Amino acid sequence: LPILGVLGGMGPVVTAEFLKSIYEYNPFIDKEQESPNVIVFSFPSAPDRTGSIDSGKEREFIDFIQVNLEHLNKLADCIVIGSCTAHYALPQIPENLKDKLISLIKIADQELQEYNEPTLLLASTGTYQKKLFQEGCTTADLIISLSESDQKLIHEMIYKVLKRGHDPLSILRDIEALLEKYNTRSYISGSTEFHLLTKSLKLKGIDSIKAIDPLSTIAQNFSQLII
């Protein structure tokens, strides 16, 4: 049977919620033995992703990701890293340890190709500085970048609200105002913590916003993706 390996804890709150999403969008028909097999390494002691760039200690962070990929390579058939910003480590990781990897940036790129309307990239300043989405996506011309001022505002939402476990709906007004400002009805979860907003939106039945949310997509399409 096929096993998903999650390298998480890079948002422990969102890592936990992602595992919930998997079984929410894969309810069994008769028996639990039908349901997805998953291994989660939820290690919040991972050095801050943006912080490791903002200081100089990228090597410390790249070593963290590398060692834990070696582990999961032995245990899982496919692997996801639960942080977009953490994908900046990948060019420094050997190609053999990345064979099983399902990239959140590629997953986002595919969904945006099908959607084919301009969409607002919500992400960390470090994800922005590293230009992961602009350099990674075939659909980069459909990505609307936040201005520097609005980048900082999103960074605040991620760390002050979403990472601390607070009600993701408490930033919905701020996000609608951004979506309006940038003249669009959609966003990309450039930070994984917007998985939490995406879930809270689908719960309340708000379908005015279109969320390109890689973790939602991976959860929904587990059976197709995980081989």
Binding site for ligand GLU (CB under 6 A): 10-11, 49, 83-86, 124, 127, 158, 191-193
The rounded distance, in Å, linking the Cα atoms of 110 and 115 is 9
Cβ pair 43, 68 in contact under 8 A: yes
In angstroms, the Cα distances linking 82 to 15, 129, 203 are 7, 19, 22
Q: 180's torsion region: left (phi>0), alpha (psi -120 to 50) or beta?
A: alpha
By C-beta, is 5 or 11 nearer to ligand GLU?
11
Q: Which residues of 102-112 are buried (b: 16+ CB within 10 A; e: fewer)?
A: bbbbebbbebb
* Contacted by 1, from a copy of itself, ligand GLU, none: CB < 5 to 8 Å by type: a copy of itself
* Contacted by 68, from a copy of itself, ligand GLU, none: CB < 5 to 8 Å by type: none
Using rule CB under 8 A, residue 44 touches a copy of itself: yes
The rounded distance, in Å, linking the Cα atoms of 140 and 121 is 10
By C-beta, is 74 or 173 nearer to a copy of itself?
74
Cβ pair 7, 41 in contact under 8 A: yes
Q: Is 138 annotated as a binding residue?
A: no
Min separation Cβ 14 and a copy of itself, Å: 10
Using rule CB under 8 A, residue 218 touches a copy of itself: no
Q: 123's torsion region: left (phi>0), alpha (psi -120 to 50) or beta?
A: beta
Q: Is 163 annotated as a binding residue?
A: yes
By C-beta, is 145 or 220 nearer to a copy of itself?
220
By C-beta, is 40 or 179 nearer to a copy of itself?
40
Min separation Cβ 63 and ligand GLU, Å: 16
* Contacted by 192, from a copy of itself, ligand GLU, none: CB < 5 to 8 Å by type: ligand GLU
Q: Is 193 annotated as a binding residue?
A: yes
Using rule CB under 8 A, residue 169 touches a copy of itself: no
Closest to 18 in 3D by CA, of 38, 43, 47, 1: 38
DSSP state of 37: E
Q: Which residues bind a copy of itself (CB under 8 A)?
A: 1, 9, 11-13, 15-17, 19-20, 22-24, 27-28, 31-48, 71, 75, 163-165
Residue numbers in the known binding site are: 49, 84-85, 163, 192-193
